[PDB]
Structure formats: structure tokens, C-alpha cells
Design a binder for this molecule. Structure first.
Ligand SMILES: Nc1nc2c(ncn2[C@@H]2O[C@H](COP(=O)(O)OP(=O)(O)OP(=O)(O)O)[C@@H](O)[C@H]2O)c(=O)[nH]1
Ligand SMILES: Nc1nc2c(ncn2[C@@H]2O[C@H](COP(=O)(O)OP(=O)(O)O)[C@@H](O)[C@H]2O)c(=O)[nH]1
Ligand SMILES: COc1cc(S(=O)(=O)Oc2ccc3[nH]c(C)cc3c2)cc(OC)c1OC
Ligand SMILES: [Ca+2]
Ligand SMILES: [Mg+2]
Ligand SMILES: [Mg+2]
Lengths: 427, 440, 69
């Protein structure tokens, strides 16, 4: 088969990673002890993509949990599905990151990165045909942003021919007030551009706006945001986990979604987004997933052009209707799709809907409008970097102003590249 | 004698191979276990169907075919399907990882690890032939395996078998049932690479088949099974002369002489009739004249193009079923006076006719109605260059921005191969314009 | 006339053998050029990654220099 190795790093990565494993285990009929109590054989045809077959029909997640402090590590093990994870895959440090990118990437994570690579080597060697790696982490903290990117470079060093995928969570002032978060994201973006094949931009600002505006939650918690992330991660991995005519894998997604290697930052979208206390049709579902309010990144697609789009419809629905509706939105919004990439919208239908839903739709888009997300981080970055505020955190770990300037200019180059192909035309 | 070895490459080639060989067994009365009660010679024979089937001592009729794919999932269905016992396990060759819709991985990175094994299996089939005539290569244009591995296989077959005949059944990409966004790249790369190694290539436009199934069979969302069962009918008509024998039967190579005026002009346009549902065929017997007239309707062609806007260089009619020459000549006479049939000035305007008396067969439970007679027209028309133009235009839109090219360069290819391939396609389009111009 | 008959069948053999030879050499060149190119790209990728490790082993060298001061 085609196996994927999952890695969760930092507090954010371990939190959303656990929720991801909870949702898909229920979709595949896997209880917290690792046994299969499912009802359909379609749940086990591609089960070994994320799970390992142990003794006694025990499905063990092919996941590795990494953190620089055992705080988030111990809470995951005591959670609902904490006993399904392989005990030897818990790799935690003690000194902690302290929301310092230089600590995770150079000082503290480097002392632990070699021990994490050993667990990766054991899991990758047990794969018949390894697809690659998916990393859940944040770009605002220290372990997810610093040690997460250090892991990517180290894994890319031993597996240069495997796909590197990340579920990166963007910092937002509306969620966390930590001042050094714009520094951590820009340094991480400078790393993700060079060493990842595909990155899902999970913007906390977009997640907070969805909860505050659409879900009508006055005080959104991290659990409210993670409920959006778990549904998004369940969707964008449905074609990996469930069968179909697609035979989906990580490389085919990268080949058709990434016209230029650096422009591999996707804008997730999900529909429906309904609140507790409120029959959806296919035309309403397609128009909803292309709406700006349903994007998991705080970007307006009407402010840019789509390079490529991948759409997934979950639930028992008319496939002929989905084909017409997906064609309908492309025709009515032809200006927002680049003309020099023919047939740049892909659609799939899965008969298995998510838990508690009859129909759903998850959106993966490579839009030039993703530069709006990067502009916000760059604006917050240069506001502090102009005053050189809080630079003693990183310079005391061994860095200098060159690495900050290189990270800033490289991310500024990324935005201008997204603008170049937005303005490009066929003639 | 005159055995033909079929090679099915990639998902499209393999699945079409399933439809073709299932249809062959129904036509020849072969059971899924390989037994044919009507065959009284056990362990061999010189019958017509032996051009496509070898016989074992146990009476099993084994297809002269090899199925190749870089991933196992599609071929595993053959290994566990209804006709699993029909194929020896060595004929079904799989890898562990497909080409990821990348010509370079199909041709170089993944393909090179299995190419020797495929040739050895083909050599085993070839050594069982007293009179090996050629190869039939089934593949898609747009797939990484169907384009990359096929071209590598075609080059290797030229080395191992010389100028021995190699015919192609190629699936032309269509957005209605597409698979990848880089299909214009894969199509141009494989067409350029295979062009000097193929003697004759029958292209099948997936959009044309999709439209025919929707229009003539009232299928709202046709499946690959729907398309493949219709494709297998066209393939069966083309290979019927090799698999059957009769007084009015004309060998395919005799058609091939008329179909290929120049080595690079070897892409015949195929048209099939009647494609009709059981509900519409009930109490409706379609005559020789009606099915022959349907061959000159552009809606029945395998590749979307307008022969009225081009010039004919050959026109062959392959009838099967209850057909006599008297009806054919009358039908052709009516068409000549009522249709837009313009020939180039350097070739005769006559129509070449073959008749196989074996009636068309349908797969039980299929959507195609069983009719008393059918016809496939093979025409060499300059209008088929419209398919190259549309494909070459989609290539130009992406290559102008070098979009997705890094996935090919990362596997070892160079930008020079892309421009070299595209210039070859430009030469082919110019060649089609040249043959259509009148003489001085 | 017999001499011409020999020359025609010899020319047919020469052109068929040349076609086999040209294909064999073209394929050998392409597979060798592809192997060199792909290896050169993987070597370049590893060179940048191994340079990053050099930069990581140097950043730690600066902190050990200032912590003892
Ligand atoms: N007519 C028809 N076309 C098919 C079929 N299966 C795939 N295709 C076409 O093939 C093209 C994609 O190529 P594939 O054959 O699926 O890919 P492949 O040969 O397996 O190579 P990979 O990239 O490694 O998967 C698409 O344009 C499809 O329309 C089929 O069963 N019938
Ligand atoms: N959506 C979401 N965001 C989170 C979660 N935990 C942390 N974050 C974000 O991540 C940033 C802090 O990263 P952190 O978790 O401390 O990374 P660490 O230092 O590696 O543990 C903040 O800006 C938060 O917005 C979570 O459970 N869900
Ligand atoms: C799990 O992630 C997916 C993987 C795949 S894929 O492996 O078939 O790759 C492809 C194939 C053809 C394509 N055309 C375009 C424009 C993108 C694209 C990607 C397709 C997806 O969308 C239906 C996926 O998201 C759910
Ligand atoms: Ca016999
Ligand atoms: Mg924290
Ligand atoms: Mg395939």
C-alpha cells in the first residue's frame, strides 16, 4: 500500500493531531484500544495508510508525538484515544521552548531532534511504500515552529524523494497575545517555502472569525477552533483514507496542485458551517465552499486568482448534480481562475460523510489571494523588526540580524511571486 | 501463424484490455476458465482465433496479452475478477508505486525498474508464436504510466523486434473524464517519443465516447465501464479480420496499406455504428444503408473533428454481421452523392470494404443492444489534425508559464525535451496541412 | 539485374539494422542523461540541507561562546 507517517510537534500540533486521530478512528470504526468495531469493509480497504497492523487485529496510528515539555504530551495520553498510540512514539523533552523559534530550531530542539529521527526511521522502515510525512504544528510557538521546521529539514535529508506535507497553524492577535509570534512565523515560512511540497494554511484569524461571526460564539476557545481543524483535516485526507476511482496519494496532489514549487500554500475551505441551535442541497453546498466566509485562511479569493482547486464532496448525493454545479461556479466566476492552466479544478465524491453530517464539502485551493495571509504576518513582523524589539530572545541563542532579514525578504519574494502569476495572462 | 500480442499499459490500457478480452471470449465462445468446447483441436491449432489465443494441453485458451501497470490496484481486479483464470500470473505485471501522473516517472524513474521484466514476459509470449505479426499497445495519453512507460516500451520493442508492426490504441485526454492537469504535457511527450516507433495509431477521444454514451445510450453520467465496452466494440471490429476468416474478410494490414500514405500520417479516424440502446433497437432493424450513413455523421466519430472541413486520404468500411456486398455498394452510391466527401488529388476516391459474417456480440447486462449488423469506418482525414491543435494549444498555455515543468525536471528531464516535443508536434500539424494541398 | 537485386535486399537490411541501432543509442543516451540530471538535482538538494546543518552547528557555536562570557 501507500503509507503516511504522521508527526505532531508542539502544543498546537499535538492538540489538533489528537483530534484528527479521534475523528478518523470513528470514521474507520476504531475504538480507543485499537480494535475494529466498524460496519463497512470500505473502512479497512485503505486503513494501513495511517494505521499499522499489530498483533490481535490492533490498529496502531502511525503517529509520532514531539514536544519540548511533557505538559501537552501527558494530557494526550490520558485523553479518550490516548491508549491507542504507540507508547514508544512519545518523544518529549524537559527544558521547554518558551515560544522561542531559535530554541526549537537551534538550541533545545536540536538536542532532541536526533531522538525524534530514530522513531521516524523505525516507522518508515516498516512501510511497504512510504508516501511521505504530514506534520501538524504551529508557527507561533517554539517547538512547533522551530523544532518542526528543523525536523522537516532533517527528514528531507534522509528522505529527499518523499513528499513533505504540513498542517501549519498561522498565528493571530485575535487568538494569542504573544508578541514574538510574528517572528516565529516569518522564520518558519522561510523554512516551509524551501523544504515542503504542500502546506495547508490553517489561519487562526480565519478560525476565530468563523467561530465569532458564523458560529455566533462570543468567546471562542481552542476547542471551538480545533473543531474546525478536525473537520478540515478529515476532509483533505478523505481521498487518502477512503477508496475510489482516484487512488489518491500525496504526490498526485502535489503534482496537480503546485504549478511552481515555492507556491505550495493551500487555502482550506469547509461547508456547511452551521451552529448548534439553527436539508442542504448540492448547489448550496458548492456555492458555500467557494465563499470567503468558509475559508480556513483569512483571505478573499475574489482578491486573487485560483491557480488550482481540488474539491471533495462527502455524502450520498447526485454525482451528475455535483458535476453541473462545479461547472456552474467556474463559468460564473471565470475571471477568478487562471486561463493558462486548463482544467484546473478537480472534484471527487465520497459516499462516507463525516460524523453527524449527511453531506459535506471540503475545499483545497492554491489561490494567489493567499498573499493576504502572508502580508498580515509580514506587516506584524516589520513593525517589531523596525524597532528591533525582543531580538535578545533569538540573538542570545546564536542567531543574528541576517537570518531575520533573509526570512523577511524571502517571504516578501513569495508574495511578489503570487502577484506575478495573478497578473499573468494567456496573451 | 500471424499471431498478435496485445500489451495493455496503465489503468486505461488495462481496463480497456478487460473489456476487449471479455468481448473476445464472448465472440469466440471461450468460458472464463479458458475452455472452448467448440475447439476440437486440443493443445494448439491453426484456427483464426489462435492469432489472439494460445492453447495449453489442458484445453485452456490463454490470451496473447501482457498487462502492465506501475501500481497493483487496477490489475489486482483482473487477478481476482471474473476472468482471473484466463490469464497466467506472469502475464499480469505490477509495481508498488505508480508514475504520479508524471511522464518522467513513468518513462525514467519508476518505469526503468520494471521495463526489463516486462520485455522478458513479452519475449516469452513471442517465443510461443510461429508467425508473430506485430503488437497492439493499449494506453492513455494523459497518464504517467500510459505515456511515460508506453514510450519507453515502444522504443525497446523497436530494438528487440526491429520494424515489426506496432499498432496503438491511444486514449485522447478529455476534461469531462480527465485525471490530471498535466495531461497535455504527457500527451505531447509520448506522441513525440512514440511517433517514429508506431506504424499506426487509433486515437480515441474520451469526450467523443462520453458524448456518444450520453446521446445514443441515454446514460447521464457514463462510467469507464460504459466507455470501455463501447471502445472494445471498435477494437473488436478492427481486429475481427485477424480473429475470424471469410471470403469477404479483408486483413487489417491490407487496410493499413491504404491508411498510411506517409510514415508520420498514421492516425486513422474511427467511426462506429450502430450505437443504440435495447429500448430503441426493439422493433428497429437498422439496415446496411442506415449504419453506413451513420459513419459520416461527425457525432459518431471516436475523435472530435470535422472531416467536412478536411480532405480524405483513405476510407475503409469494416462491416460485420448480416451484410452482403450488394447492399454496401448501393449504400456507398447514395452517400457519395449526398455527403461532403472530398479526397486529396493524389489518391483514388474508392472505398475499401471488408465484411465479417460473425455478428456483433454484446456483454450480457451491458447497455449496448445486440444488432444483426454493424460497421466501423477507418478514414485517414486531415481533419484529425484538429485533435493535435487543441491538444497542442493546451500545452502552449501551460508551457508559456513553465507551469508544472519543475515536476518533470526534478525527475531528470530537461526543458529541451519539451520544446523538442512541441516542435515535433508543430511539424506534424504542418505535415497534415501539406498533404491536403493540391498538386501543382 | 542480379547485382541490383542483391543491393536492394542489402539496403533493406542496412536500413532496418540502422533503425535498431539508432533507437538503441538514443535510448541509452536519454537514460544516461536522465540519471545524471536526477542525481544532480538530488545532490543539490542534499547540499543545501547539509549546508543548513553547518549553519545549525554554527549557531550553537555562537551561544556557547557568549554563555561563558
Ligand atoms: N476510456 C477510458 N479512459 C480511461 C480509463 N481509465 C483511465 N482513463 C483515462 O486515462 C487518463 C489518465 O491516465 P491513466 O491510465 O489513468 O494513468 P496511468 O496510465 O495509470 O499512469 P499513472 O499516472 O501512473 O496512474 C485520463 O484522461 C482518463 O480519462 C478507462 O478505463 N477507459
Ligand atoms: N487552532 C489552534 N491553535 C493553537 C492551539 N494551540 C496553540 N495554538 C496556536 O499556536 C500558537 C502558540 O503555539 P504553541 O502551541 O505554544 O507552540 P509550541 O511552543 O510548540 O507548543 C498560538 O498563536 C495559538 O494561536 C490549538 O489547540 N488550536
Ligand atoms: C487527499 O488529497 C487529494 C488528492 C487527490 S489526487 O491524489 O487524486 O491528486 C490529484 C489528481 C488530479 C488533480 N487535479 C487537480 C486540479 C488537483 C489534483 C490532484 C485529489 C484530491 O481532490 C479530489 C485530494 O483532496 C481530497
Ligand atoms: Ca485448437
Ligand atoms: Mg503553549
Ligand atoms: Mg494509475
Amino acid at each position: 500500500m501507500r503509507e503516511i507517517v504522521h508527526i505532531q510537534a508542539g502544543q498546537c500540533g499535538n492538540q489538533i493531531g489528537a483530534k484528527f486521530w479521534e475523528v478518523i478512528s470513528d470514521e474507520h470504526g476504531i475504538d480507543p484500544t485499537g480494535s475494529y468495531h466498524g460496519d463497512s469493509d470500505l473502512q479497512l480497504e485503505r486503513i494501513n495508510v495511517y494505521y499499522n497492523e499489530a498483533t490481535g487485529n490492533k490498529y496502531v496510528p502511525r503517529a509520532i508525538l514531539v514536544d519540548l515539555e511533557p505538559g501537552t504530551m501527558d494530557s494526550v495520553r490520558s485523553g479518550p484515544f490516548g491508549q491507542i498510540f504507540r507508547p514508544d512514539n512519545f518523544v518529549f523533552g524537559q527544558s521547554g521552548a518558551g515560544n522561542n523559534w531559535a530554541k526549537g530550531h537551534y538550541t533545545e530542539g536540536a538536542e532532541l531532534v536526533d531522538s525524534v529521527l530514530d522513531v521516524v526511521r523505525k516507522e518508515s522502515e516498516s512501510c511497504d511504500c512510504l508516501q511521505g510525512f504530514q506534520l501538524t504544528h504551529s508557527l507561533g510557538g517554539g517547538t512547533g515552529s522551530g523544532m518542526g521546521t528543523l525536523l522537516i529539514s532533517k527528514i528531507r535529508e534522509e528522505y529527499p524523494d518523499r513528499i513533505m506535507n504540513t498542517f501549519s497553524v498561522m498565528p493571530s492577535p485575535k487568538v494569542s497575545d504573544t508578541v514574538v509570534e510574528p517572528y516565529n512565523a516569518t522564520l518558519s515560512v522561510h523554512q516551509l517555502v524551501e523544504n515542503t511540497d504542500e502546506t495547508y494554511c490553517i489561519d487562526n484569524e480565519a478560525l476565530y472569525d468563523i467561530c465569532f461571526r458564523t458560529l455566533k460564539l462570543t468567546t471562542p476557545t481552542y476547542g471551538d477552533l480545533n473543531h474546525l481543524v478536525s473537520a478540515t483535516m478529515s476532509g483533505v485526507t478523505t481521498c487518502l483514507r477512503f477508496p475510489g476511482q482516484l487512488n489518491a496519494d500525496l504526490r498526485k496532489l502535489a503534482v496537480n496542485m503546485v504549478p511552481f514549487p515555492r507556491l505550495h500554500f493551500f487555502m482550506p475551505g469547509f461547508a456547511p458551517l452551521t451552529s448548534r441551535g439553527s436539508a442542504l442541497t448540492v448547489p448550496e453546498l458548492t456555492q458555500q465552499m467557494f465563499d470567503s466566509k468558509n475559508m480556513m485562511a483569512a483571505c478573499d479569493p475574489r482578491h486573487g486568482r485560483y491557480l488550482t482547486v481540488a474539491a471533495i464532496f462527502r455524502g450520498r448525493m447526485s454525482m451528475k448534480e455535483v458535476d453541473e454545479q462545479m461547472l456552474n461556479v467556474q463559468n460564473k466566476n471565470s475571471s477568478y481562475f487562471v486561463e493558462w492552466i486548463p482544467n484546473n479544478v478537480k472534484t471527487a465524491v465520497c459516499d462516507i460523510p463525516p460524523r453527524g453530517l449527511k453531506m459535506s464539502a471540503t475545499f483545497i485551493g492554491n489561490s494567489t489571494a493567499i498573499q493576504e495571509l502572508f502580508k498580515r504576518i509580514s506587516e506584524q513582523f516589520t513593525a517589531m523588526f523596525r524597532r528591533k524589539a525582543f531580538l535578545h530572545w533569538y540573538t542570545g541563542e546564536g542567531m543574528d540580524e541576517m537570518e531575520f532579514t533573509e526570512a523577511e525578504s524571502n517571504m516578501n519574494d513569495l508574495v511578489s511571486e503570487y502577484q506575478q502569476y495573478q497578473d499573468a495572462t494567456a496573451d | 501463424m500471424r499471431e498478435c500480442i496485445s500489451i495493455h499499459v496503465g489503468q486505461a490500457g488495462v481496463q480497456i484490455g478487460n473489456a476487449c478480452w471479455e468481448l473476445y471470449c464472448l465472440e469466440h465462445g471461450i468460458q472464463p476458465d479458458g475452455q472452448m468446447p467448440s475447439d476440437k483441436t486440443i493443445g494448439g491449432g491453426d484456427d483464426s482465433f489462435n492469432t489472439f489465443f494460445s492453447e495449453t494441453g489442458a484445453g485452456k485458451h490463454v490470451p496473447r496479452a501482457v498487462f502492465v501497470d506501475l501500481e497493483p490496484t487496477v490489475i489486482d481486479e483482473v487477478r481476482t475478477g471474473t476472468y482471473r483464470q484466463l490469464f497466467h500470473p506472469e502475464q499480469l505485471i505490477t509495481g508498488k508505486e505508480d508514475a504520479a501522473n508524471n511522464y518522467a516517472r513513468g518513462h525514467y524513474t519508476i518505469g526503468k525498474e520494471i521495463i526489463d521484466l516486462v520485455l522478458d514476459r513479452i519475449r516469452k509470449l513471442a517465443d510461443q508464436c510461429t508467425g508473430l505479426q506485430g503488437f497492439l499497445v493499449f494506453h492513455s495519453f494523459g497518464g504517467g504510466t500510459g505515456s511515460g512507460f508506453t514510450s519507453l516500451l515502444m522504443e525497446r520493442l523497436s530494438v528487440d523486434y526491429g520494424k515489426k508492426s506496432k499498432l496503438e490504441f491511444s486514449i485522447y485526454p478529455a476534461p469531462q473524464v480527465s485525471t490530471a492537469v498535466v495531461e497535455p504535457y504527457n500527451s505531447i511527450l509520448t506522441t513525440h517519443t512514440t511517433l517514429e516507433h508506431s506504424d499506426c495509431a487509433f486515437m480515441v477521444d474520451n469526450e467523443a465516447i462520453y458524448d456518444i454514451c450520453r446521446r445514443n445510450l441515454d446514460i447521464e453520467r457514463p462510467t469507464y465501464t460504459n466507455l470501455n465496452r463501447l471502445i472494445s466494440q471498435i477494437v473488436s471490429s478492427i481486429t475481427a479480420s485477424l480473429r475470424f476468416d471469410g471470403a469477404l474478410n479483408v486483413d487489417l494490414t491490407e487496410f493499413q496499406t491504404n491508411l498510411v500514405p506517409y510514415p508520420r500520417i498514421h492516425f486513422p479516424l474511427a467511426t462506429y455504428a450502430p450505437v443504440i440502446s435495447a429500448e430503441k433497437a426493439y422493433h428497429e432493424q437498422l439496415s446496411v444503408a442506415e449504419i453506413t450513413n451513420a459513419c459520416f455523421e461527425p457525432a459518431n466519430q471516436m475523435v472530435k473533428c470535422d472531416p467536412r472541413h478536411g480532405k480524405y486520404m483513405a476510407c475503409c468500411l469494416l462491416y460485420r454481421g448480416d451484410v452482403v456486398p450488394k447492399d454496401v455498394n448501393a449504400a456507398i452510391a447514395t452517400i457519395k452523392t449526398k455527403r461532403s466527401i472530398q479526397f486529396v488529388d493524389w489518391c483514388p476516391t474508392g472505398f475499401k470494404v471488408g465484411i465479417n459474417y460473425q455478428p456483433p456480440t454484446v456483454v450480457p447486462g451491458g447497455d449496448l443492444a445486440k444488432v444483426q449488423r454493424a460497421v466501423c469506418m477507418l478514414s485517414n482525414t486531415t481533419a484529425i489534425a484538429e485533435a493535435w491543435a487543441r491538444l497542442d494549444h493546451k500545452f502552449d498555455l501551460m508551457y508559456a508559464k513553465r507551469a508544472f515543468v519543475h515536476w518533470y525536471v526534478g525527475e531528470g528531464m530537461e526543458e529541451g525535451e519539451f520544446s523538442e516535443a512541441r516542435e515535433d508536434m508543430a511539424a506534424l500539424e504542418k505535415d497534415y496541412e501539406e498533404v491536403g494541398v493540391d498538386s501543382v | 539485374k542480379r547485382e541490383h537485386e542483391r543491393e536492394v535486399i542489402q539496403k533493406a537490411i542496412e536500413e532496418n539494422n540502422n533503425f535498431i541501432k539508432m533507437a538503441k543509442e538514443k535510448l541509452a543516451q536519454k537514460m544516461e542523461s536522465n540519471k545524471e540530471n536526477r542525481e544532480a538535482h538530488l545532490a543539490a538538494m542534499l547540499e543545501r540541507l547539509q549546508e543548513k546543518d553547518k549553519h545549525a552547528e554554527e549557531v550553537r557555536k555562537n551561544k556557547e561562546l557568549k554563555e561563558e562570557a
